[PDB]
């Protein structure tokens, strides 16, 4: 049985957290997808080295460790949603991060509460790309549970997050998520009129999901 433990993020964590978040995303990526051509593994690295310092002082995000080979197989990647550093995107992962903010800016600012230390904003989830399909279901069934325990214990209302792949919006739906908009996503325009998930089928989904803790 896969034993883990999690541990907050800490400085020298860098390297590792990136190749699990670019082995996790690049290609992988439900949306990121329908953008080839020029999405490039860089795109993802060079947005966490510019948030790096901040992510780890925030105290909020973690990693997770096999404890039998003490390794890091998963990180999850947390920010108050009201408190997030401002990072200007390059590549065209900037419409991956416009769209999420047309599902999650409506609902976030009208619906959601008010103030700092209310929404904790589950912004990535990862796990190491080695991981076969029961220790990839095991550590995202952890850092599910481990993301409730840092919101209550740092004394949030609840946890917000948009997901975008069938995996994740399952096990949210399943962990009694609330679904705040299920938008499909080849119906999203860019602001030159062109959409950029269109070729996407219409049966993928953006899911806006919100739990009280
Ligand atoms: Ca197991």
């Not at 290609?27 to 060079?46: C, F, M």
């Not at 904003?121 to 796990?127: A, D, I, L, P, Q």
Request: glycine content about 4%; proline content about 4%.
């Amino acid at each position: 049985m896969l034993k883990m433990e999690a541990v907050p993020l800490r400085l020298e964590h860098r390297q590792e957290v990136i190749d699990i978040i670019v082995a996790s995303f690049y290609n992988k990526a439900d949306l990121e997808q329908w953008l080839k051509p020029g999405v490039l593994r860089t795109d993802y690295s060079d947005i966490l080295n510019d948030i790096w310092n901040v992510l780890v002082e925030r105290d909020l995000s973690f990693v997770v460790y096999d404890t039998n080979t003490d390794r890091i197989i998963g990180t999850a990647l947390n920010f108050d949603a009201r408190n997030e550093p401002e990072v200007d995107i390059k590549s065209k992962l900037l419409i991956v991060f416009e769209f999420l903010e047309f599902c999650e800016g409506p609902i976030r600012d009208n619906y959601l509460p008010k103030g700092l230390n209310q929404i904790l904003h589950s912004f990535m989830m990862g796990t190491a790309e080695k991981l076969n399909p029961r220790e990839n279901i095991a550590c995202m069934h952890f850092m599910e549970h481990e993301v409730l325990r840092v919101a209550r214990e740092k004394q949030f209302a609840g946890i917000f997050t948009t997901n975008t792949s069938p995996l994740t919006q399952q096990l949210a739906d399943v962990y009694h998520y609330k679904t705040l908009l299920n938008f499909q996503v080849n119906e999203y325009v860019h602001s030159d009129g062109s959409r950029p998930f269109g070729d996407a089928p219409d049966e993928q989904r953006a899911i806006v999901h919100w739990k009280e803790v």
